[PDB]
């Protein structure tokens, strides 16, 4: 891959020339300390250094509220409502978010390729940015700190600019078209990039191995910690609706006033809601609140053999955005015994 140096006086110029290609989605301020991917109109409002987004970048490919079909009851037919989408450039995707998008690609493009997801994944440019760990981020524990594939551009921050790793095609096209604004890297910036990476690795709050969580979690399925934390839990589904790797959704039918026209709607549904695991006769396969809580923990602590990564990418959205401040990493380390160590 080619390393192209972008001096800081040309970053906004490159973003303006990037807006020529298509719509730009970058993290902007929405509240006092909340970030979200909003569509860019004025480039100066983009916050380059942001902790995390309130919604993961999966909303562009796995839309939060999507109309699958519109139907007519008479002569029963379902018409798929799919619209052509121009190539959009998602600027400011963390490494953890990039791995989450890869995981959702392995979930949604496997065996049966979802058309709605594929049509939006084939026309998107992911630009990765080197994050800085705050008090919640633990992407090193789940091994999502650095990525090799999935990004067409990687903006690695430098003291005197931005180091751009192209990595993939069409990144070459963008860089070659705007090569007037770009420069060439030498050891001067390489040493600074290495020092920044060393500082980033050293700044993580947690540093321990999590090899045997998937095995030990089954031995301690009936821990009193589950009961206590579930009774502390509010069952609002925020930990899943903001999660980047939750594939679950709920399909509902809406029929108009005429009684002959309607549409089918898809939205994200969490485990905490009652009707996620319900069958006929009022039987629920995770009836109690602790049952659904443990189901979420076990499911996020599963193993994806396609790429060897656990479905949790360590973004920290679940622990940060939980109203009850239930620590995911604290609970999971207490499963290991780093907090109690009774046996």
């Amino acid at each position: 891959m080619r390393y192209v140096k972008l001096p800081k006086e040309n970053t906004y110029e490159f973003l303006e020339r990037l807006k020529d290609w298509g719509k730009l989605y970058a993290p902007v301020k929405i509240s006092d300390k909340f970030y979200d991917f909003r569509e860019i109109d004025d480039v100066r409002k983009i916050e380059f250094h942001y902790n995390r987004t309130i919604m993961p970048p999966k909303k562009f490919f796995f839309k939060p509220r999507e109309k699958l079909f519109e139907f007519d009851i008479s002569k029963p037919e379902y018409r798929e409502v799919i619209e052509e989408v121009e190539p959009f450039i998602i600027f400011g995707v963390h490494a953890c978010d990039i791995y989450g998008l890869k995981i959702l690609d392995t979930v949604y493009l496997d065996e049966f390729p979802d058309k709605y997801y594929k049509v939006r994944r084939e026309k998107g440019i992911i630009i990765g940015i080197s994050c800085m760990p705050d008090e919640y981020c633990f992407c090193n524990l789940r091994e999502t700190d650095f990525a090799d594939d999935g990004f067409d551009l990687f903006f690695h921050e430098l003291p005197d600019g931005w180091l751009v790793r192209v990595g993939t095609p069409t990144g070459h096209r963008l860089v070659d078209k705007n090569i007037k604004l770009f420069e060439e890297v030498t050891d001067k910036d390489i040493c600074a990039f290495r020092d920044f990476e060393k500082r980033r690795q050293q700044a993580f709050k947690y540093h321990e191995d999590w090899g045997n969580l998937r095995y030990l979690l089954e031995l301690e399925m009936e821990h009193p910690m589950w009961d206590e934390e579930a009774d502390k839990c509010l069952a609002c589904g925020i930990c899943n609706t903001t999660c980047p790797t939750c594939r679950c959704y709920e399909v509902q039918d809406i029929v108009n006033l005429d009684g002959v026209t309607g549409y089918r709607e898809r939205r994200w549904d969490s485990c905490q809601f009652r009707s996620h695991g319900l069958v006929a006769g009022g039987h629920n396969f995770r009836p109690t609140k602790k049952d659904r809580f443990r189901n979420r923990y076990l499911c996020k602590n599963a193993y994806n053999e396609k790429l060897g990564l656990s479905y949790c990418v360590g973004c920290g959205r679940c622990t940060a955005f939980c109203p009850a401040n239930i620590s995911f990493v604290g609970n999971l380390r207490r499963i290991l015994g780093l907090e109690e160590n009774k046996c």
Binding site: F112, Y215, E218, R247, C248, Y249, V255, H276, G277, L298
Partner: protein, 281 residues
């Protein structure tokens, strides 16, 4: 074309009122191109879609050799099922393709089969029984045990009792027993009480079980106590499904060590899979 959620049109040919709380339906796709090529493995389910109501899964209970036709035994226990029950022959319904892996009938050839059905789960076992009967040459003596709990709820009781003489002629022991009907003039006892009288040789027997998982432990203990091979036991379990293509996330089973999904890792499972991950039952 490439849309995985896409459906196909199918019209109900004949409705058959099976019991008070169940009904049997006959289907054939409107498109001849789909009808002449559609096929399935015994055990695979179909995402039946009523327009404007919802999508529900029903296991196919027909013989796969009969191209262009299949049967769905549906019970009215909720909203979509209540709407389905009102459907008359010569009406339209959207049906999605087969999903999941059926019973391993391809690997089964010549060995004796112990098809033990309990409650509602008779439909996949009815399908595998019809498949075995349609190719009776490549199988040994087979025992089909269908059980219920209210006496009248013996699914396909008339069809089995009509074929009872021919089954006994063809080395087939079909047994129907009730669990909570002392007054019913028939066979009383649990399915475990009747699998002890199985004609199948335990050394070369494959077993298929379906129905409520609360009797799964008892039937497993009874089968393993008689020397039946645990490597040839296969069951079917149901969870909530809304997609059938592995993206809904509702049908999640197992633990962190083995987090299976039924639409892709079933619904036909294995004995060591059942005992390996607690919580499947």
């Amino acid at each position: 074309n490439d849309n995985p959620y896409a459906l196909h049109r199918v019209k109900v040919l004949k409705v058959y009122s099976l019991t008070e709380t169940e009904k049997l339906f006959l289907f054939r796709f409107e498109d001849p191109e789909l009808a002449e090529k559609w096929t399935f493995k015994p055990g695979q389910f179909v995402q039946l879609t009523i327009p404007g109501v919802g999508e529900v899964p029903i296991s196919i209970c027909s013989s796969p050799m009969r191209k262009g036709f299949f049967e769905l035994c549906i019970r009215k226990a909720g909203r979509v099922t209540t709407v389905v029950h009102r459907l008359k022959p010569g009406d339209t319904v959207l049906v999605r393709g087969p999903y999941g892996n059926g019973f391993p009938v391809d690997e089964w050839e010549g060995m004796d089969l112990l098809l033990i059905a309990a409650g509602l789960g008779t439909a996949p076992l009815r399908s595998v029984f019809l498949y075995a009967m349609d190719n009776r040459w490549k199988y040994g003596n087979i025992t089909f045990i269908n059980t219920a709990r209210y006496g009248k709820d013996l699914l396909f009781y008339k069809e089995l009792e009509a074929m009872k003489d021919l089954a006994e002629a063809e080395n087939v022991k079909i047994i129907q027993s009730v669990t909570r009907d002392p007054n019913w003039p028939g066979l009383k006892g649990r399915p475990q009480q009747f699998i002890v009288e199985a004609n199948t040789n335990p050394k070369n027997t494959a077993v298929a079980i379906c129905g409520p998982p609360r009797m799964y432990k008892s039937v497993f203990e009874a089968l393993i106590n008689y020397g039946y091979r645990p490597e040839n036991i296969f069951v079917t379990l149901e969870r909530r499904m809304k997609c059938g293509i592995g993206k809904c996330g509702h049908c999640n089973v197992g633990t962190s060590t083995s987090w299976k999904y039924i639409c892709k890792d079933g619904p036909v499972f294995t004995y060591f899979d059942i005992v390996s991950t607690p919580g499947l039952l």
